[PDB]
Amino acid sequence: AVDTAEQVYISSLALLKMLKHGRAGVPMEVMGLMLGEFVDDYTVRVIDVFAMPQSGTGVSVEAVDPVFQAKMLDMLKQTGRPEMVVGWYHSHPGFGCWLSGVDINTQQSFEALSERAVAVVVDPIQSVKGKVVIDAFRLINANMMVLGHEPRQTTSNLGHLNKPSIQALIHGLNRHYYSITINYRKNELEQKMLLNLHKKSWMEGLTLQDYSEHCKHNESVVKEMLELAKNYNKAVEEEDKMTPEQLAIKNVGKQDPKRHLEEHVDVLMTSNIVQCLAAMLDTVVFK
Amino acid sequence: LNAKVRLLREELQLLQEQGSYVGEVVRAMDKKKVLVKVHPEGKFVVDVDKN
Amino acid sequence: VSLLSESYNPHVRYGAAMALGICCAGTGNKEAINLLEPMTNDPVNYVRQGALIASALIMIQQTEITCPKVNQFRQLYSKVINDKHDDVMAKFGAILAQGILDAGGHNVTISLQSRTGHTHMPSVVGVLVFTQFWFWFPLSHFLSLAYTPTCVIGLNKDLKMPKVQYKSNCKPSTFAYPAPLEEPNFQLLDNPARVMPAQLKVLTMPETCRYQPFKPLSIGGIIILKDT
Structure with a gap:
């Protein structure tokens, strides 16, 4: 009850x-x-x-x-x-x-x-x-x-x-x-x-993708990073003296430097050091 | 970081509240009244806030 | 623990509040209470209840002298308990706070310590099982084993009841009763009398009676008197 x-x-x-x-x-x-x-x-x-x-x-x-x-x-x-x-x-x-x-x-x-x-x-x-x-x-x-x-x-x-x-x-x-x-x-x-329903077996872990596509991908990312840093120069050197409380209000448009740099740092480093590490693993594990 | 994640949870809560109709002021009146007009409909004689 | 009380999740905020409430319990502390001032101002209700409980657990037997926030919090308990629109889980803390504040006629203080820093066991067991009222109400009804009467007493020939009255020359407001609503330098404290470990060290044995306390009195306990 x-x-x-x-x-x-x-x-x-x-x-x-x-x-x-x-x-x-x-x-x-x-x-x-x-x-x-x-x-x-x-x-x-x-x-x-x-x-x-x-x-x-x-x-x-x-x-x-x-x-x-x-x-x-x-x-x-x-x-x-x-x-x-x-x-x-x-x-x-x-x-x-x-x-x-x-x-x-x-x-x-x-x-x-x-x-x-x-x-x-x-x-x-x-x-x-x-x-x-x-x-x-x-x-x-x-x-x-x-x-x-x-x-x-x-x-x-x-x-x-x-x-x-x-x-x-x-x-x-x-x-x-x-x-x-x-x-x-x-x-x-x-x-x-x-x-454990997300992993793969050992062929996925030890696989270099390809070196031609890796070179072309790095070439493309560095190529766009050139123009992105060129925009970053003007973005830093302008920096109009008026407090970001409105510089975040003129940023709400299409403006993009200082924000896409570190993302390109991440996608460059975490795709290069992994590939180099896996290349070393492949070249001295099998022998 | 903790202020940011707490603000995100409270933002998920507060985003359910209603909006606000924009308008333009025609003229002020006496005893703290203004004449506003919304865009599709006509005019409204509304009051002001303390702040 | 101060930043841990501001976590994203309110269970950790409840835990931080209760950790402040059971660690520095029995000793009125400025900064621990200071961390509990904004704890009872937040949308989550059970952390408000825990904040009220932990704040009432650390203002025990201290009347408006060592910590000056006692009267404001004592009004706060009645304000929350008399409000018509509040969480019932919050007013659980409000009703229990009046119980744990004026416990035992202002004669028992919970303390995990003892006479010389040796760990006192029923108090610790009682506080640990007091942390389980989130799962059962009579399970955390265990608190009388956490309560020890703080008095100085002692009888000469086993049960020979003496008369010792002296209290130190400090002003009679630090050791005063709460004096419910319903300038002498020295005061009188008869043979059963309460003494809390905030000005335990100030009192003196009377020099008018021939009996002397043998043990160098700095303890709440049992004495012998040698009537010379």
Whole structure:
């Protein structure tokens, strides 16, 4: 009879499949059912996710014949892990990452089966390379406002570690439901696998590109560096006596010396010393 | 460097706020009122700020 | 730690504030409090709570003499706790600050040290488990093991209760009580009386009674009296 300091675990494959299926149906809302378990009364783990055939309108997306869902959850018992359907997710492209009027409609139906039912909202438009926008919502009773929804016996899910947004606070947020804090659990088998999918084998490490293209590239960079330094001379020698507070206001046009020099220093040095070092490695390793 | 990265995070926060309509002043009036005109629409008798 | 309190991430700012609050705790310090003045002015709420807690942990039992910022911060606690529009996680620090400030009727000061610089163990364990109220409320309820009563007492024939009254000739405001809202040179401090380690070194044994304290009194503890 208490909603404690809850937490949701999501696996790596679940998030990757989540974002791929959200992007694959970019202009409308795609659907999905989550696979997981209730590890304890405190936290809920999602270990897998899967998608179904749908039928989408301009503003709505419905399911199809659910013999797919029953037979799929029957067949997934046979290979490996026989979990349950702990929640459902959809997508909200370009929207406020919030539960809408009809989104909250089926949340009652999903909550009527099991109490610990979690909705997940992902968005592939506002998500960028370094951070995917994600949220998990739990429907609260709209009949009980006078009491407390979660006692907050500690300070985990609060202004701690996350802040409520503005657009979520418009369409609902702490009204009619609430949010829960997501953390990612990583097992060692996938932990020491995920950090190595960018490298190459030894032919990439020991390979001189070519010397003709390297000479022509250095010739081109030095050739443009000539005119760039010639512009830099006039840029330094003018330096009109009037405080950069406006010299940064006459710089906002097409003017470019003092700024492209050190970039050319970097691309010259980090492409020459690497090639010379690799040439030495190739000429005395093999012998 | 720490001021720069904190300014970048607060800039990501503050960039969600609204803009500001430019205009030209026709003439000042009494009791700290000016007559401005926006570009597509007509004129407005607006007030001034303390600063 | 001063620049570390200005990091991009507010968890490190909370940690820097709490490190200031548990390191120079029990000794009112000018510069540590000076670093905590702008700490309670920032959009992040839990670092405001930690700043209030760490500031209340370092102004214990010091009444407006060694550090003159006590009254302003004591008004600040009531200002935050009486405000109708603030973060509830922030006012956690405001309600707990009044508890840790006037702890035990202004009779117990938390101190990780002891009589001679030997490390005192229940205080250190209590502060380390006090750092876990971010994860459980009763787990960091442990603070009574971090509280030691700072008094000088001692009884002659095991339980023979004596009468020693003298206090040094310093003005009666450094050692004064907070005198809640609800010029003699010397003062009187009866046989149970509090003494804090800010002017612990100034007091003298009375020269009117025949009993003498044996041990050269510079300690908050237990004495014997030889009634000559």
